[PDB]
């Protein structure tokens with residue numbers, strides 16, 4: 001009778017119960033199989049030694065359905081320890097998820113896990129809701145994808161969504177590369193996990209990119225120390241802000257794309273004149289890769305440079321924004337008016353999987 | 362871009378545009394065909410002379426689909442003069458309408474009249490909404506059927522709906538019968554229309570049934586005069602309140618059913634204890650046959666006799682209650698939140714007619 005909320009990301013699954021303010025289970029979105037029997041999440045991780053690890057979700061889209069069933073089987077029976085036939089399930093999807101994927105998702109829930117009711121919601125919409133608004137533009141930068149999504153009264157505007165395949169995992173690889181400028185090798189998937197850790201702990205977004213580079217090459221006060229697992233210590237300086245600077249200048253990594261400040265602006269510009277002003281004042285950050293200190297001040301300054309000079313620009317960057325999608329679905333799944341909007345097994349029996357596209361809002 | 366609202370009753374079609382406070386077209390729900398080429402509504406009526414008249418809706422349910430298409434064709438092209446491919450259409454249905462009927466209704470709208478979007482709503486729910494409430498019990502007595510419908514937050518409670526096949530048309534026939542106690546014959550479908558007219562103009566609900574009969578047989582002050590079309594005049598006395606008294610005592614007409622005060626009570630009693638009190642305080646009358654003067658005071662007194670003696674009983678009987686279903690749909694179709702709940706042609710293409718049962722609320 002409690003609803004389950006499951007948020008499937010490229011990197012992490014966040015799953016739990018509606019009514020909570022945090023996912024009970026967060027675990028790597030991976031399936032592992034013997035190098036020449038399958039393991040999931042945290043499982044797969046303890047034995048990575050003798051497995052090939054596969055990610056079933058790439059850039060926010062489900063591409064391996066057999067593995068995804070195993071992530072879902074693990075989520076219900078091992079992580080949450082519930083019987084799925086007893087619980088309405090809310091699932092999340094990427095903006096612009098293909099219609100065919102969303103139907104396949106519905107079919108699996110109903111025919112393989114026998115849920116009484118499910119729903120599929122766009123991630124960025126749930127994060128807007130978790131901030132208390134129904135109109136806004138969300139910047140959702142996770143592990144695999146970054147999406148700008150303008151939303152008006154609860155409804156995502158498909159023609160103005162921007163997709164940038166440049167996310168947290170790319171920033172980790174770019175940190176690996178530049179650290180092997182001050183002499184370090186990382187290269188293995190294990191050492192990659194170490195650099196991911198450094199990234200999350202030491203990196204930050206510089207208020208002015210150049211001046212910051214001038215500073216780091218004039219005093220040792222930006223260097224920080226970091227202990228590796230083998231005991232050895234490493235020093236990190238200018239790499240701390242150069243790594244995330246990539247989101248503002250993708251040419252750092254050889255991509256020809258606009259940075260996250262320009263896609264935000266361009267997405268606002270694909271909207272009707274009569275709401276632009278509401279979008280400028282309600283930019284919401286969401287996802288793990290928006291956690292860098294300085295990123296929200298940085299965003300404010302860049303978007304004010306591009307927008308008409310009299311526009312009121314406000315960046316909202318809540319402290320819980322790494323889980324905001326999940327918390328959004330926790331709130332939504334608890335509303336009594338949401339209860340009539342679940343897709344029930346009866347509705348699916350009578351109409352089949354394409355029922356899933358009548359969102360009801 | 363304006364929505365159409367069409368309310369199909371056993372006797373009258375009420376049709377018009379969302380945003381209005383009254384149906385532009387009210388006309389008899391009849392199809393006429395040459396006694397040995399088809400005519401509708403008011404049409405069929407001017408030539409009844411050489412046609413057989415058929416009612417395609419009986420006791421609120423559509424039973425002749427070919428005729429019903431002609432009522433709908435006439436509604437769009439002759440009465441409202443619009444192109445149906447250009448307008449979302451809201452249709453109404455009886456409580457407990459079979460699933461199969463509602464699908465057939467959807468299929469015709471989409472495949473024969475090519476509407477962009479439609480919706481099918483339960484009549485009694487729209488009348489509740491027109492009174493400004495989302496919780497209440499509606500007594501809807503029309504020409505062909507009477508329905509008691511308890512509704513909690515906008516949703517009709519199917520297991521407590523009561524259906525009584527005793528409505529305005531039966532009261533007309535019973536008035537014909539008792540008038541041929543003071544010497545008058547009516548018998549033909551034309552004279553039936555005359556008695557219907559007398560019914561609507563002269564009849565009323567007595568506050569105490571017996572005392573009223575005692576009164577009419579003690580002074581000529583209750584008789585009223587009525588001019589027939591051929592010039593002759595008729596006198597009506599005790600028949601004025603005996604006719605509608607039938608709704609309270611169906612044995613007047615040989616039926617073994619409970620009266621409208623008992624089905625109301627029984628329907629309230631099939632509900633959960635924790636809302637009964639809200640239903641007792643929000644009884645809404647709706648439909649042509651609730652127009653009799655005195656009926657709402659009458660209802661108050663009868664339901665107070667049956668309910669627990671400390672209950673607060675309130676009867677709401679708005680002046681516009683003969684059109685309240687239509688006005689309900691006029692309001693609903695205008696809400697911006699309703700706009701995402703239309704069934705679109707795309708949704709119907711992908712899922713077919715059984716899409717219609719995902720009500721969204």
Ligand SMILES: Nc1ncnc2c1ncn2[C@@H]1O[C@H](COP(=O)(O)OP(=O)(O)OP(=O)(O)O)[C@@H](O)[C@H]1O
Nearest residue numbers: 009010011012060142143144145168287288289291
């Ligand atoms: N404090 C932090 N600073 C910078 N990055 C971080 C921080 N915390 C987590 N991240 C990064 O956020 C990413 C995980 O984020 P998230 O759970 O939002 O993504 P996801 O939903 O799995 O993937 P996606 O939305 O791309 O499909 C990882 O790359 C992780 O390193």
Ligand SMILES: Nc1ncnc2c1ncn2[C@@H]1O[C@H](COP(=O)(O)OP(=O)(O)OP(=O)(O)O)[C@@H](O)[C@H]1O
Nearest residue numbers: 370371372373421503504505506529648649650652
């Ligand atoms: N003032 C009135 N007093 C008594 N009865 C009336 C009055 N006005 C209309 N009626 C009756 O109301 C009936 C028409 O009501 P209405 O339009 O609500 O029914 P309907 O929707 O066609 O049919 P139903 O809901 O049974 O399918 C007719 O029987 C008509 O005689």
Ligand SMILES: C/C1=C/C(=O)O[C@@H]2C[C@@H](CC[C@H](C)/C=C\C=C/CC1)O[C@@](O)([C@@H]1CSC(=O)N1)C2
Nearest residue numbers: 011012028029030045143168169172192193196
């Ligand atoms: C605390 C934590 C955060 C996280 O987000 O992990 C996701 C999950 C993960 C799966 C692969 C590795 C082997 C496995 C184990 C597990 C652990 C927990 C990881 O690979 C990412 O690391 C990629 C690689 S490098 C990067 O930047 N994203 C992001």
Ligand SMILES: C/C1=C/C(=O)O[C@@H]2C[C@@H](CC[C@H](C)/C=C\C=C/CC1)O[C@@](O)([C@@H]1CSC(=O)N1)C2
Nearest residue numbers: 372373389390391406504529530533553554557
């Ligand atoms: C002003 C009006 C109200 C009405 O409700 O009519 C509906 C429609 C109607 C159809 C049959 C007759 C021949 C046709 C013509 C038309 C006219 C308009 C009628 O037959 C009813 O009369 C029945 C018969 S007797 C009664 O009580 N209900 C109710």
Ligand SMILES: [Mg+2]
Nearest residue numbers: 009010123142
């Ligand atoms: Mg995500």
Ligand SMILES: [Mg+2]
Nearest residue numbers: 055169170173
């Ligand atoms: Mg990879």
Ligand SMILES: [Mg+2]
Nearest residue numbers: 370371484503
């Ligand atoms: Mg009616």
Ligand SMILES: [Mg+2]
Nearest residue numbers: 416530531534
């Ligand atoms: Mg008849």
